[PDB]
Amino acid sequence: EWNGMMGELLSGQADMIVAPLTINNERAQYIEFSKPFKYQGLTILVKKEI
Amino acid sequence: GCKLVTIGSGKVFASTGYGIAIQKDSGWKRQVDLAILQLFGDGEMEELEAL
Amino acid sequence: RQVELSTMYRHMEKHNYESAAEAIQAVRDNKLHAFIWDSAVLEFEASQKCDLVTTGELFFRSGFGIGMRKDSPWKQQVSLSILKSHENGFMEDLDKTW
Amino acid sequence: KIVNIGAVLSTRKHEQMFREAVNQANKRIQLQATSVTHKPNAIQMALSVCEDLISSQVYAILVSHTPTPVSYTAGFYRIPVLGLTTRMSIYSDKSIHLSFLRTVPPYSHQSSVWFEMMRVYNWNHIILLVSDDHEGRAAQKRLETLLEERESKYDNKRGPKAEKVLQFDPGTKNVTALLMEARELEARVIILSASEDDAATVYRAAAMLDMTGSGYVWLVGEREISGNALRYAPDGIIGLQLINGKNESAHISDAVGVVAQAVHELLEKENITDPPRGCVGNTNIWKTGPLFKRVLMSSKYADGVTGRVEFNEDGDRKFAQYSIMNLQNRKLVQVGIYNGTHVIPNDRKIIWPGGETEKPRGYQMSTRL
Amino acid sequence: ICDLMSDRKIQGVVFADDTDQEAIAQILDFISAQTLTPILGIHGGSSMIMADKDESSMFFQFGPSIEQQASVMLNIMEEYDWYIFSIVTTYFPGYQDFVNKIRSTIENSFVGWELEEVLLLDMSLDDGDCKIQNQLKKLQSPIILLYCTKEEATYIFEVANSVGLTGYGYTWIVPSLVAGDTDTVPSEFPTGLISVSYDEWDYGLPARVRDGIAIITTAASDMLSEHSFIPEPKSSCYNTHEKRIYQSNMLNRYLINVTFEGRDLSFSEDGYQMHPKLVIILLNKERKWERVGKWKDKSLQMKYYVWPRMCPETDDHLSIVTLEEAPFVIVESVDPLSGTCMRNTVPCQKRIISENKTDEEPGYIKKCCKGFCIDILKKISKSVKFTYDLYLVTNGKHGKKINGTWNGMIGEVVMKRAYMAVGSLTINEERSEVVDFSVPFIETGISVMVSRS
Amino acid sequence: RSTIENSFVGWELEEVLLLDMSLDDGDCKIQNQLKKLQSPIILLYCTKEE
Amino acid sequence: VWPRMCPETDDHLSIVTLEEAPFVIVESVDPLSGTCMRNTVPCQKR
Ligand SMILES: *[C@@H]1O[C@H](CO)[C@@H](O[C@@H]2O[C@H](CO)[C@@H](O)[C@H](O)[C@H]2NC(C)=O)[C@H](O)[C@H]1NC(C)=O
Ligand SMILES: *[C@@H]1O[C@H](CO)[C@@H](O[C@@H]2O[C@H](CO)[C@@H](O)[C@H](O)[C@H]2NC(C)=O)[C@H](O)[C@H]1NC(C)=O
Ligand SMILES: *[C@@H]1O[C@H](CO)[C@@H](O)[C@H](O)[C@H]1NC(C)=O
Ligand SMILES: *[C@@H]1O[C@H](CO)[C@@H](O)[C@H](O)[C@H]1NC(C)=O
Ligand SMILES: *[C@@H]1O[C@H](CO)[C@@H](O)[C@H](O)[C@H]1NC(C)=O
């Protein structure tokens, strides 16, 4: 099963997901893709040095 | 924080090392020997300290 | 699914949060040491507030494209259009906007 | 219901004893036999094999004495045949010879018991002396085979291992070079497998090289003592006797026994044919021959004249027993025996080449390094 | 034979037949060391090898040398760069020195050889156990080697044929004596089966007769030159028993080297000729052989540049071309000591035309291919498991629209001159609508650079 | 499997194969795919007769 | 501990050590399972 924006999509509650969508292997085994409209990646965040 | 360190560059008294000793008077010695030998064979020890 | 983080994933169920904004608040209150997300968003975040800093490296090459289900012709049209933007400074303009 | 099987032996005496033995098996479907002589050359042997033998629609043959041509024939016909006397290595592998089995092990397998003899003496060191040939390569082969060891679980020391190896040409005039090499060797325990003239040469060589003294060891089997080699043979040298090997008749008999076992248990099976009669015009090997062979492999005879009989991966007599020998005052005496796991020392006190009852330890470590 | 010595006096013997049963030559060879008699089989199975002859035999045959037999097999592998293979034998002679030559050749070079497995069939037993069938079911290569008698090969081809090793993505290469005869085809032979033999057409049978005759000829001339005598042959196999110690045979040393008519027939001490004529044979679609190649002077010239292959019904191979571009592609000259590219590096072809005014278009010279995007093709390949090729690209760096057409790689796709392509692809709207795209695996874009002074 | 992958546990499953008790054996297919079993211990689900 | 015979092959061995930083991890098993997780290995407490 699924939940989330993916979910309402597969269930059909909407046509379009507009979002900073992570592009994985799995979802494409279900949902179609475009060219990327941005290039982001992983990172980490912490408090700046006093 | 980064504070302590050993004296000097790491000059060490009593040059020695860790290993695995076993039941004495076996044959399994040479076998495990060749083993961790192969462990530096793949150089997996790199991965090991890395972790 | 990976062998390496298996320790990590094992350790990371605990303190995870619902909305990354909450995390921003939390480390911003020093209730967190660090948080995991996709970079650009955070570059925007610390870029807004002096208190925080991007991580050292950059990894897991990734990107964003419009969510659409299964097979509907709309895919081609959309993406083609998005190139039809990246062809020009429209996107950079989008930086200028945000 | 007729059963035809051949033999070739030295004298008609073993023809008569041979057929009589076949009758002793009749009490154990009907048998029939055939036998002829040994040929001087190779060709006429096979000739009489077709004309005299194969024409009889023969299941098996018996051989003594390279006798190899017989097997060449049997092989082109793929027909299993078992003789007696050959200890030659040519029958080691199935390589040239598909279907063949033996009553006794080859010269090689002496070492098999040698190693365990060391275990009776707890020796960590050896001296391997062999010329190189088919035979020798066999010797070193199985030798090192046992010498691949220490898969366990004993051996209060580091364990037995091969000290050094030496090859030399057969029929060599003088090998003494490798002997002086053996002088600096770390041990006094020498091992030898060599032919007749070979053994003579190496013994005399030892005499000049005066390694015949105290603390030295010499490990050989029975092949050495026989022949003129005994004349030059060194004092008190360790030796062996393959049990009964010189005995033609009883071996022929027990062979016939194994044959019978194959008859009763095998022929109860189905899809059976008969080998061809005439050699001429027949190119087709007998479809069942290999199966008959495998039956010979699985064959286990509980009661023989010589007792139980066994076979190896190559179908060769296994867990066979030996007579263990030594020289005393130019006279050989039987010092012990072997079954499969151990040597049984007899009541006699084992005599070493040197002084009395001291069993020396050849591990002596030269302060020269 | 014996009566052949009794009737006339034969200092020598020539033997041949068309049959497939080599044991003929076996026991013949035996007789060689028996009678101290030179005998030359020139043809047929009588040429086939029996491993490890007698040290006292004088015998010879015309047939490839076991070591260099499988070595020719190796160069065969060197043609089309077939890396993934196995070898299968029985207890039949030669396997030991065989394998030794195999691996010994393998690990000693910069080449990228990879050997999966080797298994040993049993033809001695019959099959209730499918053990043959099973360990054949363990075979992962697209092509594998088999070493055995044609008779055995029948049963093998049958069983493995049931296992499904005979399809596309499957081929077999066997030594010469394996399939043996030109004209005798057991049907169960695999389609498009591969081997190599002494030339069927280019090598004449009577010519061979002359070959051996001349061999023994000049040889006897070599003893008569030096010694000026030859041992009187023993005319009776019976009487041969007393002549053992009498005859002193030095002949071998001269027998080995024979220089005549410009084509050296010289053998070697192990029972093989130095440079025998060798010809690659391949099975047609009609199950009738044709001479598909030749191995001469320790060298190869193939009849085709690229391998003929059918693929009736599964198109599981694809076409790819790109330009080497820094960094993403390596292209280098193959090593002279091998002739293919090394390590994990992959092959490619070069379409360079010679003259502007001519066509003459085989248009290929193999050259190295390796590097990053190459390895992208690698990973994806081993993932979805499908074949791939690459070759140099003629026209332009990437591609453009001149007037109504496209001058470049992508265009080289749109005309279906090639199925796929790689390299550095600006992914645009322009080139988009004519083609299709993936997720991009590299993030990049327009940028400029200068020097900080 | 549903139990398997859902936990922090380190479970590792090698293989699962399906025997045929319908046919009889000339093919050793049962025998073979059993010959594919690498575990020190494995589970079997079937009738005592089988 | 599991009863096991091993008549004739002693192919199992005995090992004990103290957890020592870094080189050993020792932790409480997860309550929702009861064994240790991931690649982590068991041990006993005397
Ligand atoms: C074997 O007997 C003597 C043993 O010494 C041999 O003499 C040695 O021969 C080798 C090889 O020819 C030489 O390298 C040594 O220098 C010789 N040493 C001495 C002390 O003579 C003799 O050569 C051999 N017998 C024959 C007939 O050659
Ligand atoms: C050959 O003799 C030895 C000497 O006893 C036998 O060794 C015994 O073997 C039995 C079983 O085979 C063991 O239970 C004994 O512990 C062994 N005792 C000794 C002293 O070795 C050996 O079994 C005999 N050969 C055969 C084939 O039975
Ligand atoms: C062969 O063995 C038998 C039985 O041990 C014995 O008679 C003798 O050693 C040999 N046979 C003859 C007839 O000498
Ligand atoms: C040959 O023998 C086999 C083994 O018993 C048996 O199937 C039958 O007798 C023959 N084979 C066939 C296929 O009939
Ligand atoms: C080749 O023939 C010549 C002719 O005399 C001879 O000298 C030479 O030894 C031969 N080659 C070999 C390897 O014997």
Tokens 């010595």 appear where? E5
Please report all neighbours of D, defined by 3+ CB atom pairs within 8 A: B, E
Whether the Cβ atoms of residue E435 and residue E415 lie closer than 8 Å to each other: no
- Cβ within 8 Å, pair D290-E241: no
CB of E125 within 8 Å of any CB in chain D? yes
Whether cis (ω within 30° of 0) applies to the bond prior to D67 is no
Q: How far apart are CA A9 and CA A15, in angstroms?
A: 7
Residue D78, both tokens: 């793929």
Q: How far apart are CA E378 and CA G12, in angstroms?
A: 42
Q: How far apart are CA A47 and CA E244, in angstroms?
A: 101
Residues of chain G with Cβ-Cβ distance to C3 below 8 Å are: 39
Which among F5, E379, E2 has a CA at the least distance from the CA of D47? E2
- As a three-state string, the secondary structure of chain E is CHHHHHHCCCCCEEEECCCCCCHHHHHHHHHHHHHCCCEEEEEHHHHCCCCCCCCCCCCECCCCCHHHHHHHHHHHHHHHCCCCCCEEECCCCCHHHHHHHHHHHHHCCCECCCCCCEEECCCCCCCCCCHHHHHHCCCCCCEEEEECCHHHHHHHHHHHHHHCCCCCCCEEEECHHHHCCCCCCCCCCCCCCEEEECCCCCCCHHHHHHHHHHHHHHHHHHHHHHCCCCCCCCCCCCHHHCCCCCCCCCHHHHHHCCCCCCCCCCEECCCEECCCCEEEEEECCCCCEEECEEEECCEEEECCCCCCCCCCCCCCCCCECCCCCCCCCECCCCCCCCCCCECCCEEEECCCCCCCCCCCCCCCCCEEEECHHHHHHHHHHHHHCCCCCCECCCCCCCCCECCCCECCHHHHHHCCCCCECCCCCCCCCCCHHHCCCCCCCCCCCCCCCCCCC
Count CB neighbours of D343 within 10 A. 18
Q: How far apart are CA E365 and CA E361, in angstroms?
A: 12
Cα end-to-end distance, chain C, whole Å: 35
Query: At CB < 8 Å, which residues of chain A contact E?
Result: 23, 28, 33, 35-36, 39
Which ligand neighbours the alpha carbon of D271 most closely?
A: 4
Q: Which of residues 76-95 of C touch F (CB under 8 A)?
A: none
Which backbone phi and psi does F13 adopt, to 5 degrees?
-105, 125
Count CB neighbours of D29 within 10 A. 9
Q: Which residues contact E172 (CB under 8 A, 6 or more apart)?
A: E143, E144, E145, E146, E190, E193, E194
The residue type of D309 is V
Q: How far apart are CA E1 and CA D236, in angstroms?
A: 53
D261-269, long-range: CB < 8 A, 24+ apart: D261/D299, D261/D300, D261/D301, D262/D292, D262/D295, D262/D296, D262/D299, D263/D3, D263/D29, D264/D28, D265/D295, D265/D299, D266/D292, D266/D295, D267/D29
**Which helix (H) or strand (E) is C94 found in, with range?**
helix C90-97
Which among G23, D197, E326, D52 has a CA at the least distance from the CA of B19? G23
Cα–chain center distance at E323: 31
Neighbouring-strand partners of residue E272: E268
Which among D305, D227, D284, D221 has a CA at the least distance from the CA of D17? D305
Q: How far apart are CA E20 and CA E149, in angstroms?
A: 10
Q: Side-chain half-sphere of E237: how many Cα atoms within 13 Å?
A: 16
Whether cis (ω within 30° of 0) applies to the bond prior to E327 is yes
Q: What is the DSSP letter of D10?
A: S
Whether the Cβ atoms of residue D141 and residue D107 lie closer than 8 Å to each other: no
DSSP D66-115: --THHHHHHHHTT---B-S----GGGSSSSS-SS-B-SS--GGGHHHHHH
Look at ligand 1, atom 4, and give the residue with the nearest C-alpha.
Answer: D176
Q: Under DSSP, is residue A43 helix (H, G, I), strand (E, B) or coil?
A: strand
Q: Under DSSP, is residue F39 helix (H, G, I), strand (E, B) or coil?
A: coil
Q: How far apart are CA D199 and CA D222, in angstroms?
A: 12
Q: How was this structure determined?
A: cryo-EM
Q: Under DSSP, is residue A11 helix (H, G, I), strand (E, B) or coil?
A: helix
**Cα D344 to ligand 2 centroid, rounded to whole Å:** 10
Residues of chain A with Cβ-Cβ distance to E437 below 8 Å are: 35
Whether the Cβ atoms of residue E361 and residue E334 lie closer than 8 Å to each other: no
Which among E125, E269, E276, E270 has a CA at the least distance from the CA of E198? E276
Which ligand neighbours the alpha carbon of D254 most closely?
A: 3
Residue E255, both tokens: 């027998």
Q: Which residues contact A15 (CB under 8 A, 6 or more apart)?
A: C68, C69
Count CB neighbours of D336 within 10 A. 19
Q: What is the DSSP letter of A39?
A: E
Whether the Cβ atoms of residue E347 and residue E320 lie closer than 8 Å to each other: no
Whether the Cβ atoms of residue D36 and residue D52 lie closer than 8 Å to each other: yes
Residues of chain E with Cβ-Cβ distance to C87 below 8 Å are: 428-430
Q: How far apart are CA C36 and CA C39, in angstroms?
A: 9
Residues of chain A with Cβ-Cβ distance to C82 below 8 Å are: 34-35, 37
Q: How far apart are CA E240 and CA E32, in angstroms?
A: 12
Residue D98, both tokens: 């598909």
DSSP G24-38: ----PPPTTTSS-BT
Q: Which residues contact E359 (CB under 8 A, 6 or more apart)?
A: none
Angle between helices D249-267 and D12-26 (to 10 degrees): 40
Q: How far apart are CA E70 and CA E195, in angstroms?
A: 11
Whether the Cβ atoms of residue D189 and residue D123 lie closer than 8 Å to each other: yes
Q: In chain G, what is the greatest distance between 2 CA atoms, to the nearest angstrom? A: 40
Tokens 């080995």 appear where? E256
Experimental structure resolution, Å: 4.6
DSSP D213-251: STT-EEE--TTTTTTTHHHHPPTT-EEEEETTTT--HHH
Look at ligand 3, atom 3, and give the residue with the nearest C-alpha.
Answer: D250
Which among C86, D353, D207 has a CA at the least distance from the CA of E440? C86
Q: Which of residues 5-44 of F touch E (CB under 8 A)?
A: 26-28, 31-32, 35
**Cα D261 to ligand 5 centroid, rounded to whole Å:** 59
Residue B10, both tokens: 């790491």
- Cβ within 8 Å, pair E437-A23: no
CB of E130 within 8 Å of any CB in chain F? yes
Minimum-distance ligand 2 atom for the alpha carbon of D338: 1
Residue D314, both tokens: 């190559």
Neighbouring-strand partners of residue D239: D325
Tokens 């026994």 appear where? D257
Q: Dihedral of CA A41/A44/A48/B3: which sign? A: negative
Q: How far apart are CA D251 and CA D245, in angstroms?
A: 8
Whether the Cβ atoms of residue D211 and residue D181 lie closer than 8 Å to each other: no
Q: Are strands D331-338 and D322-328 parallel, antiparallel or unpaired?
A: antiparallel
A43 is in an annotated binding site: no
Q: Which residues contact E271 (CB under 8 A, 6 or more apart)?
A: E49, E53, E57, E59, E60, E61
Whether the Cβ atoms of residue D22 and residue D257 lie closer than 8 Å to each other: no
Q: Which residues of G5-27 are buried (b: 16+ CB within 10 A; e: fewer)?
A: eeeeeeeeeeeeeeeeeeeeeee
Residues with CB under 6 A from ligand 4: D 270-271
Whether the Cβ atoms of residue A39 and residue C82 lie closer than 8 Å to each other: no
| Residue of chain A whose Cα is closest to the Cα of E440 | A35
Smallest Cβ–Cβ distance between C83 and the set E429, E441, E443 belongs to E429
Look at ligand 5, atom 12, and give the residue with the nearest C-alpha.
Answer: E257
Residue D113, both tokens: 């018991």
Q: Which residues contact E403 (CB under 8 A, 6 or more apart)?
A: none
Decide whether any atom of ligand 3 lies within 6 Å of the D243 Cβ.
no
Decide whether any atom of ligand 5 lies within 6 Å of the E256 Cβ.
yes
G vs A contact (3+ beta-carbon pairs below 8 A): no
CA distance C13 to chain G (A): 13
Task: Tell which of E429, E436, E441 to mutate to test the C interface (max C CBs under 10 Å).
Answer: E429
DSSP D299-339: --BS--SS--B---TTS---S--EEEEEEETTEEEEEEEE-
CB of E134 within 8 Å of any CB in chain F? yes
Binding-site annotation, residues of C: 38
In degrees, to the nearest 5, what angle opens at C-alpha D122 toward C-alphas D119 and D125?
105
Which among D267, D269, D259 has a CA at the least distance from the CA of D299? D259
Burial of E445 (0-12, 13-18, 19+ CB in 10 A): exposed
Which among E56, E48, E50, E42 has a CA at the least distance from the CA of E14? E42
Which among E60, E282, E68 has a CA at the least distance from the CA of E182? E282
Neighbouring-strand partners of residue E60: E40
Whether the Cβ atoms of residue D73 and residue D52 lie closer than 8 Å to each other: no
